[PDB]
Design a protein around this ligand. Structure first.
Ligand SMILES: CC1=C(/C=C/C(C)=C/C=C/C(C)=C/CO)C(C)(C)CCC1
Length: 175
């Protein structure tokens, strides 16, 4: 079989938090259960002088009563024994936005053009993920390069998530 156990998933070696800092445009995503960022998603990663990584994220989202809003989210990352695996505590500027603590894994990135992120929120008893999400980020809010598309596809197929992503519009609803 292709291994879909979360524990077997390869992640970015020698992940470099400082290099990852800056603006990342979410170009594609795979959604988890329940409420989630819908579109117009742009993240801003930062790393302080003590190496603590954090990020803000903007995106459009509809609230359980379908109502629409621009979310301003904030996340702070706790390092683990794996440099590419973090715990991300997050919340919104607005009190009504979802809060939580998610795995945040950098599956792959070249720091200059793309990144593939992943989070499993719930393990199946067989070790596969029961509830995941994943972002494909770009430094440039255009399309990738065929060459980069290939690499992202391979990563997506490592996560057992190939063919489960949707393209994300950007049209300044948030600005
Ligand atoms: C914080 C943040 C992230 C996740 C945001 C999430 C999970 C938003 C969910 C918002 C909801 C459900 C709002 C409605 O109440 C990602 C991974 C983009 C990276 C940058 C920082």
């Amino acid at each position: 079989e292709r291994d879909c156990r979360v524990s077997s998933f390869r992640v970015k070696e020698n992940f470099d938090k400082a290099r990852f800092a800056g603006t990342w445009y979410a170009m594609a995503k795979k959604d988890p259960e329940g409420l989630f960022l819908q579109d117009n998603i742009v993240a801003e990663f930062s790393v302080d002088e003590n190496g603590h990584m954090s990020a803000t994220a903007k995106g459009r989202v509809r609230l359980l009563n379908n109502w629409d809003v621009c979310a301003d989210m904030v996340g702070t990352f706790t390092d683990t024994e794996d440099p590419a695996k973090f715990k991300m505590k997050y919340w919104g500027v607005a009190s009504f936005l979802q809060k939580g603590n998610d795995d945040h894994w950098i599956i792959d990135t070249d720091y200059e053009t793309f990144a593939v992120q992943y989070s499993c929120r719930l393990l199946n008893l067989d070790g596969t993920c029961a509830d995941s999400y994943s972002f494909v980020f770009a430094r440039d809010p255009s399309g990738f390069s065929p060459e980069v598309q290939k690499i992202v596809r391979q990563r997506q197929e490592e996560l057992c998530l190939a063919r489960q992503y949707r393209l994300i519009p950007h049209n300044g609803y948030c600005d």
